[PDB]
Amino acid sequence: RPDFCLEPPYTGPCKARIIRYFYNAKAGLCQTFVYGGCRAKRNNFKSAEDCMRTCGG
């Protein structure tokens, strides 16, 4: 899996409160977090399908 899948999720400094998915390597699956709407890091997926496929192998 890409190394960025190991980074903790990043809400960022903007004020939206939208659900995004990130890969939790300790838990072994993608989980939800709140994304603020700007400056996403790569462990941030709009689609949970994308999160599991990109990071779950």
- What residue ranges do the domains of the chain occupy? 1-57
Cβ-contact 23, 1 below 8 angstroms: yes
Cβ-contact 20, 46 below 8 angstroms: yes
User: For 1-57, CATH number?
Assistant: 4.10.410.10
Amino acid at 50: D
Cβ-contact 14, 40 below 8 angstroms: no
CA distance 57 to 46: 18
Nearest partner of 41 among 2, 11, 16, 3, judged by Cα: 11
Residues 6+ apart with CB under 8 A from 31: 21, 22, 24
CA distance 39 to 57: 26
Per DSSP (E only), the strands in 1-57 are 18-24, 29-35
Kindly provide the resolution of this structure in angstroms, with one decimal: 1.7
